Amino acid sequence: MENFQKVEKIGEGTYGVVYKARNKLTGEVVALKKIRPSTAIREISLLKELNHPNIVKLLDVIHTENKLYLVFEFLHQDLKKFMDASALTGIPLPLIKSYLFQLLQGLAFCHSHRVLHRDLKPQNLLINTEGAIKLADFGLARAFGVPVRTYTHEVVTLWYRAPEILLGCKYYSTAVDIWSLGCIFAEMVTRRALFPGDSEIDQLFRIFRTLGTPDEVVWPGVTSMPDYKPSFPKWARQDFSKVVPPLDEDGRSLLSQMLHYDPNKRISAKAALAHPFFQDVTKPVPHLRL
Numbered sequence: 001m002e003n004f005q006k007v008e009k010i011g012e013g014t015y016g017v018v019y020k021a022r023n024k025l026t027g028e029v030v031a032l033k034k035i036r037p038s039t040a041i042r043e044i045s046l047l048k049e050l051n052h053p054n055i056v057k058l059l060d061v062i063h064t065e066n067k068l069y070l071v072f073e074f075l076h077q078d079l080k081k082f083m084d085a086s087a088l089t090g091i092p093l094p095l096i097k098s099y100l101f102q103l104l105q106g107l108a109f110c111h112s113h114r115v116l117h118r119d120l121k122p123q124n125l126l127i128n129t130e131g132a133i134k135l136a137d138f139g140l141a142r143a144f145g146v147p148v149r150t151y152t153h154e155v156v157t158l159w160y161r162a163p164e165i166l167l168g169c170k171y172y173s174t175a176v177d178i179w180s181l182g183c184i185f186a187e188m189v190t191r192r193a194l195f196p197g198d199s200e201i202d203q204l205f206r207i208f209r210t211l212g213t214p215d216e217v218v219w220p221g222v223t224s225m226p227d228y229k230p231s232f233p234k235w236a237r238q239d240f241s242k243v244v245p246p247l248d249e250d251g252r253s254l255l256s257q258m259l260h261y262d263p264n265k266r267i268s269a270k271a272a273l274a275h276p277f278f279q280d281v282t283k284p285v286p287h288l289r290l
């Protein structure tokens with residue numbers, strides 16, 4: 001775009017190239033996303049009004065010479081990079097708590113306007129020096145469905161996918177985002193991915209090896225689902241003290257409610273914020289190197 005001066009290529013998205021740019025009129029540093037129907041245009045235009053402190057601001061939507069440009073607020077780092085830098089020491093519990101609290105606040109706002117992300121991962125989670133965390137790419141999965149591969153042919157991660165999506169459920173609810181956040185929560189505490197599957201079936205069998213193979217008792221309607229097979233191996237449920245040590249009981253209780261099989265019984269973002277785990281939340285600042 002003409003009104004912007006590119007500074008450098010800052011990454012590869014699901015849909016297109018992400019650049020760090022500067023506006024020639026305002027002088028403001030921005031994140032410029034470039035992609036490549038009329039309904040997809042309407043969907044993204046509505047997101048310019050989904051404003052909250054824990055959601056990455058969609059500053060503008062530009063459709064020119066038959067290509068999509070998305071102007072976002074700039075944040076210096078993502079959670080994936082922070083987790084790798086903090087891998088040998090771990091992220092301190094007060095910081096893990098604050099990030100989850102703030103993420104749950106972002107989700108609660110969006111789910112109240114009937115908007116879901118559908119593809120949460122540490123990569124699309126952005127952090128700053130003031131101790132804040134924000135959700136990036138929110139609502140883009142409704143506009144264009146999640147592909148198998150990115151524009152660069154890179155494999156789209158299955159690690160954070162909810163079990164209802166993997167079983168062939170056509171009508172996804174907001175409970176899908178609560179699952180992904182729960183998986184990210186466990187990863188922050190553990191310093192290792194919860195379910196790092198490398199195929200849809202590997203992902204599904206990894207969930208089952210830990211949480212137990214679901215049945216009509218725990219999940220009413222699971223056996224009637226599109227991709228469910230009665231030939232599925234029957235694994236028993238693992239404890240939880242083995243799943244996320246050395247995390248306390250309040251943390252184990254909250255994670256358990258976020259990882260429930262039945263989407264209807266899985267805790268909402270609003271209810272999670274009322275959990276006694278957040279009794280002593282604070283807002284600490286991390287030691288960011290930029």
Ligand SMILES: CCCC(=O)Nc1n[nH]c2cc(Cl)c(-c3ccccc3)cc12
Nearest residue numbers: 013031072074075076077078124136137
């Ligand atoms: C992680 C440090 C560089 C970076 O991505 N900065 C961002 N600033 N604002 C952004 C807004 C967005 Cl939307 C995405 C971004 C994140 C995931 C996938 C595609 C794009 C990234 C940034």
